[PDB]
Curated annotation (Swiss-Prot), chains A, B:
Family of this protein: Belongs to the CpcE/RpcE/PecE family.
Pfam family, one: HEAT_2
Signal peptide bounds: none
Keyword vocabulary terms for this entry: Antenna complex, Lyase, Phycobilisome
Stated name of the protein: Phycocyanobilin lyase subunit beta
Enzyme class: lyase
Curated annotation (Swiss-Prot), chains C, D:
Oxidoreductase found in the keyword field: no
Organism expressing this protein natively: Nostoc sp. (strain PCC 7120 / SAG 25.82 / UTEX 2576)
Pfam families referenced in this protein's UniProt entry, alphabetically: HEAT_2, HEAT_PBS
EC nos: 4.-.-.-
Lyase in keyword set: yes
Gene this protein is translated from: cpcE
Protein's recorded name: Phycocyanobilin lyase subunit alpha
Gene3D superfamilies the UniProt entry points to: Leucine-rich Repeat Variant
Function: Required for the chromophorylation of the CpcA gene product.
Molecular function in Gene Ontology: lyase activity; oxidoreductase activity
GO cellular component: phycobilisome
Keywords of the record: Antenna complex, Lyase, Phycobilisome
Quaternary context: CpcE and CpcF associate to form a lyase.
Amino acid sequence: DVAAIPTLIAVFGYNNPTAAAIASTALVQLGEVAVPQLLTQIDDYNYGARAYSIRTLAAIADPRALDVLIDAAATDFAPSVRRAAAKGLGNLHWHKLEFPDNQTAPKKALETLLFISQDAEWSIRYAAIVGLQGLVNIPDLQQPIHTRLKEMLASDAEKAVRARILLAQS
Amino acid sequence: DVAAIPTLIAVFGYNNPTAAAIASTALVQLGEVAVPQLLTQIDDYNYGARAYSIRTLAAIADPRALDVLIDAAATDFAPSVRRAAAKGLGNLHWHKLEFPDNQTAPKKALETLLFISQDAEWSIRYAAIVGLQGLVNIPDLQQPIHTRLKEMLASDAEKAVRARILLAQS
Amino acid sequence: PSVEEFPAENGPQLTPELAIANLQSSDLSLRYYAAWWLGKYRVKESAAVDALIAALEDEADRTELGGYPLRRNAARALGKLGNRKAVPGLINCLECPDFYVREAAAQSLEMLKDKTAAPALIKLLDGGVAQAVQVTGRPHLVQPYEAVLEALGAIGATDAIPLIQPFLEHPVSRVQCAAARAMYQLTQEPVYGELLVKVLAGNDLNLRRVALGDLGAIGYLAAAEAIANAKAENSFKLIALKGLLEHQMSISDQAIRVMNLMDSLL
Amino acid sequence: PSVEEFPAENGPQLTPELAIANLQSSDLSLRYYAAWWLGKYRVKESAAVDALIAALEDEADRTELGGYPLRRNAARALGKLGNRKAVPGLINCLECPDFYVREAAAQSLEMLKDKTAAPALIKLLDGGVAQAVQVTGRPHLVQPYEAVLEALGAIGATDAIPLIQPFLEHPVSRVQCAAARAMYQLTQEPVYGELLVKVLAGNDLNLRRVALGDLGAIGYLAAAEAIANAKAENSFKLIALKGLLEHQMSISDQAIRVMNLMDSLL
């Protein structure tokens, strides 16, 4: 039910992962119709809740969530929030946007993912690779991704991140 | 009941202020006996919960909580945590400590409160004044408090903080 | 290898000078980040202000539906810096085609409190409530009514009252709250403060937070115990009480009453 | 006037040079803060390391029960900097009368992984489990057994096994978990890894977090799906998986299996 959307979102504020994960699943099943309220009822004062909003938007994958996800990935301080957004950025359904935003949007996602792939925290860089791999379905974007991935395989301190790069290169 | 202490503390992790406030009241009524578990079951990964631990320790006012409260006031990033600790620092039952820690302890609280009274956030400075006022029952500490309070009444950008200084000076 | 709730870094390590330079980087993400950073760290140096003003005319960075990401972040940053040199550029942003620029500008004009924005804010209320609709598929109304109404209250635009008053019956709850705030600021009638008090009692947390901020901004004394008992975080309670305290300013019994409530939320 | 979950400031605005200088300030609070800051920001410059080493012999700052606040914070900071020059001074801190210095030193020696600490760590297990009691009114055991056992595992002190093994029956759950970790590290027997898995299934959140970190540290592959399904925050899950991944290191199907689980916790 569509009337329940705000309540479902409000559940993320009660820090019970079991309950939140149920509310999120519910939102995702509702899909596109919940996206507007998910975008405008983000809890900016509870990172635990915010991470669920972002995760839910990422799973729905409506490309109208691009700018929220970019903000979250680029300027949020909470790692759980940023990682959720990084994954999401590579997997939105770009063709749902009116031409030519269906081309521009994935390119903006890429720019952000390239930017956060320099972060000092390994888990942000890991999530950034996962986002980048998601952009393989888009021909114009493959050169900078390949390129970035090679530079990271060369420079990365972390064996975990190098490994994930290798998995992405396949 | 003493067996329930860990459960009560765990309630602070479910971000329901009503439920948390009940668990905290319960802990406070139990008093000294809960202090050891409160000190060693602090949630370092959830500031919402942590603030309740600190508030509960501050309300119990057992001076064995001094070092936790100093840490929280001085190095925590969460304002709700810091403010709770600042208030608490001026109100612990110092005489419960074996001599001469009953003299040393309030003096360490004062040093911390003087230090955080310089913070840039107005609400930290406000809480610091409240802590400082709590140390009026201790004769050796009055000079530096007076002194600090005059310097703050002179320099403070915030009318709220100046007002609270005035209330403390009375 | 360890977990931190509040990390040492969220991004390139910047200084004011470096953030300011990065506004003109070929890396658009870095410009975007730097503009956020300058607002977050409240870098009020004049050269930060001038650089952000220039970024209000950015053309390099575009997004979905012709959005202007750097203009949005620059606009938001300028409001936190307290420098009214920004007002004319922010005023111009009120006619930007990107909704989110208009919104950011109106929020910053509300923070700067400069009455020279009134005519441009008034124009965004053209058509009144009847025209204050939502276009299909957009997650926003046609104009940022919430911020515009709040801004008109904050700048003391009393001529706008008859344009504002109808928004108390707007279908969107956030818009009605903003109209209540503005109406109180511009008329000082308690009935409008009371509507904010009633939002505090409501089922909606985000709305409670907004009502707290509004009650603080207007300094409505009678709401003190309702603020202190509201279901919201102490941080918002303290900001609301602080605004009440500032309106009641040595020491009246009303100020003391408010301080005593503030003391209990620590 | 506004609310921030993660504030711009928590204290004086410092640089490495200034933090290092502040270690010798007449303001003891400022020394304390600066030592925390140097660890938090992982300022690995050699002069930061040397200054913190010197602060291991601080006498200016004392607290309750003859505690040494700056020694505690210096000790904790040194472990985050990865510089084994600190090892001898940290070793000395293992005989400090202040429990919390001993604890901090043992935790940092566990992080530095230097086997030269083994004899001093071994001495803190004198008397074994029977002597591993709690003194009345102290919120801690007589020695920081948890950190000591973890440290002995991390440094590969196999001679300590027979001293460690009895702690699997210590009455305190955290001590048993540490002994399970150490036993696994030093013997590689799955039965000890399984005890950590079982803690994951337990009713105690903090304990689940500790078990996650331990499973990561030892790289116990069989725990992967239990880690991914545990009732704890993703951050801890990812750190545990990362340690598993690092033990399984191009690309085996076991590494892929772990990466696929990590992918799902974003």
